[PDB]
Amino acid sequence: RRNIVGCRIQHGWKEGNGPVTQWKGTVLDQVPVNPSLYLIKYDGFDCVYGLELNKDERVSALEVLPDRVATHLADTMIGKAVEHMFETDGSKDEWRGMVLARAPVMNTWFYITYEKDPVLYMYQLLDDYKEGDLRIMPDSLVGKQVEYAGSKRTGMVIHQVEAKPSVYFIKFDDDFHIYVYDLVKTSAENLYFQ
Ligand SMILES: CC1(C)C(N)=Nc2cc(OCCCN3Cc4ccc(OCCc5cn(CC(=O)N6CCC(CCN7CCCC7)CC6)nn5)cc4C3)c(OCC3CC3)cc21
């Protein structure tokens, strides 16, 4: 029943005439308002990336990898402000952020973003919670073109956060991160829509 979404993939990646690097990951989603755009979680890397696979010249040798193995309660986390600790070099540190949603295909994972890096991250937050590294704090425009200017940077609104309807995901044409914005906050004050 799977085509590309839900599959593990491998491909090469090449910027300029630089070296080709090999990447392995899991395709999380094909974006409804832009079916060319796939969201990808690369093994060992924590951000969610968007690539327009069918036209990005930097992608080479795309292949589907076989699954090596066959394929609730923590829903209460969704929408919660959190403090997420991590090991630095010894010292431990923390970023504060917001749990956005459960991740699409990798069941036990969660979308999360942070004030110090307001792009889309993905973590096994229930594990982190059990290890004492996640403190829980006490408690449309999709498909529209967006620009901000800070040269004229253009993109598209690809998702609205169900748990927090003023929060949206934006894919800018010039980058492969997924940007998260709360449209009522200062971080969004230079975004304009069409
Ligand atoms: C142990 C584990 C898992 C757990 N169980 N829980 C956690 C929790 C962690 O923290 C939670 C808070 C959020 N954290 C903190 C934090 C602090 C510093 C950070 O620094 C990043 C600086 C950096 C990184 N790059 C690389 C880069 O940009 N690339 C370009 C794009 C490339 C892919 C796309 N391409 C490929 C081809 C197609 C396009 C990849 C390379 N460049 N600069 C980042 C963070 C995130 C946690 O954090 C990580 C550890 C270091 C602190 C770990 C865990």
Q: Report d(CA 39, CA 57) in Å as an integer.
A: 17
Q: Atom 24, ligand 1: which residue's CA is nearest?
A: 45
Does 13 sit in the ligand 1 pocket, CB within 6 Å?
Answer: yes
Phi, psi (rounded to 5 degrees) for 64: -85, 135
Q: How far is the CA of 140 from the centre of ligand 1 (A)?
A: 31
Resolution to 1 decimal place, in Å:
1.8
Cα angle, residue 142 at apex, residues 113 and 74 outer, rounded to 5°: 40
Q: Report d(CA 151, CA 157) in Å as an integer.
A: 19
Q: How far is the CA of 120 from the centre of ligand 1 (A)?
A: 11
Can you say whether the dihedral through the CA atoms of 186, 190, 191, 194 is positive or negative? positive
Q: Atom 26, ligand 1: which residue's CA is nearest?
A: 45
Cα angle, residue 161 at apex, residues 110 and 114 outer, rounded to 5°: 55
Domain ranges of the chain: 1-71, 73-141, 142-194
Which tokens in the block code for residue 54?
């069918």
Q: Residue 127: what residue type?
A: D
Does 123 sit in the ligand 1 pocket, CB within 6 Å?
Answer: yes
Element (H, E) at 60: strand 59-65
User: Cα–Cα distances in Å, from 62 out to 10, 16, 34, 81?
Assistant: 6, 18, 20, 38
DSSP state, residue 177: B
Does 193 sit in the ligand 1 pocket, CB within 6 Å?
Answer: no
Burial class (CB in 10 A: 0-12, 13-18, 19+), 31: buried
Number of other residues whose CB lies within 10 A of the CB of residue 46: 13
Evaluate whether 55 touches 36 at the Cβ level (below 8 Å). yes
Q: How far is the CA of 164 from the centre of ligand 1 (A)?
A: 25
Atom of ligand 1 nearest to the CA of 85: 11
Does 129 sit in the ligand 1 pocket, CB within 6 Å?
Answer: no
